[PDB]
Write a protein that binds this ligand. Structure first.
Ligand code: CU
Ligand code: CU
Length: 303
């Protein structure tokens, strides 16, 4: 009975972003839908409330973009999520619960530079044989405000494009590094992504030769946003560095990363509103020689 937009008070509204009664028919199904922002001006996403069917739904992702892959009521996410860049805003995983946005922090959508659409991805895990009749309305409610937030959340995406896994090599490192040269960002969560061959992915800020861990995770565990215990400030002159560790054991051919494989690290940050950028990316390895003296911790496996 909840309408897609619910005014909350003079300045805020909730959007209820829900599957239009879908029926997953196999285990391991990804469905996607879109929701345009109802406002054309800038607005700020400041909270999220998951509404997941607690048996079947394994994970949910919410993205902001300007071109969803489809205009239909829903689609299969094999088709893509957005044809333009899809900016992740939120993850939920059943056995790795999200952490709240820090107080005073919002994502900026709408307006001139912000996303016009949300794209929701719902991943349905294992299914009982006998639910061919069943409609599901899983998704997320989103709290938006037109009140300017002091701190603006964004994403710093580190991606590997250059590396290949020679078959049967037990350990392959993919290294990513860029200098940072914007106003300060404060990293408060991260998410890792590879396919079946990823063993561990770690992110670091390097400042005057000293490495500070942002986070490290097995990319085979739930790919939600893990909190960074104490936010890591990243400033002009710092290098960001990431290492994905892959195995090629039991393979029978080269695997290109960046793609039978991928090494993605999503670093969620906030910046002071007047200096904020919503999205930054590193796709290179600017200081490869720096990795000879990476902390040994970066190479230690996680289950
Ligand atoms: Cu999942
Ligand atoms: Cu991938």
């Amino acid at each position: 009975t909840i309408g897609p937009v619910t005014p909350l008070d003079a300045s805020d509204f909730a959007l209820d972003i829900r599957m239009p009664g879908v029926t997953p028919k196999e285990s391991d199904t990804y469905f996607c839908m879109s929701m345009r922002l109802p406002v054309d001006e800038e607005a700020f996403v400041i909270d999220f409330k998951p509404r997941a069917s607690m048996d079947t739904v394994h994970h949910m992702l919410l993205f902001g973009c300007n071109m969803p892959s489809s205009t239909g009521s829903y689609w299969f996410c094999d088709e893509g999520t957005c044809t333009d860049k899809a900016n992740i805003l939120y993850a939920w995983a059943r056995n790795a619960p999200p952490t709240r946005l820090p107080k005073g922090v919002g994502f900026r959508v709408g307006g001139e530079t912000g996303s016009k659409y949300f794209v929701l991805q719902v991943h349905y895990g294992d299914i009982s044989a006998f639910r061919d009749n069943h409609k599901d309305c899983s998704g997320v409610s989103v709290h938006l405000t037109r009140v300017p937030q002091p701190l603006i959340a964004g994403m710093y995406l580190m991606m590997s494009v250059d590396t290949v896994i020679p078959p049967g090599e037990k350990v392959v490192n993919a290294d990513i590094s860029c200098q940072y040269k914007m106003y300060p960002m404060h990293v408060f969560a991260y998410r890792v992504h590879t396919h079946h061959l990823g063993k561990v992915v770690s992110g670091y800020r390097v400042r005057n030769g000293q490495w500070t861990l942002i986070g490290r995770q097995n990319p085979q565990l739930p790919q939600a946003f893990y909190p960074v215990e104490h936010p890591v400030d990243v400033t002009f002159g710092d290098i960001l560095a990431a290492r994905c560790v892959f195995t090629g054991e039991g393979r029978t051919e080269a695997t290109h990363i960046g793609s039978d494989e991928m090494c993605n690290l999503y670093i969620m940050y906030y910046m002071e509103a007047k200096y904020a950028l919503s999205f930054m990316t590193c796709t290179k390895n600017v200081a490869p020689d720096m990795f000879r003296t990476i902390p040994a911790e970066a190479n230690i496996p996680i289950p």
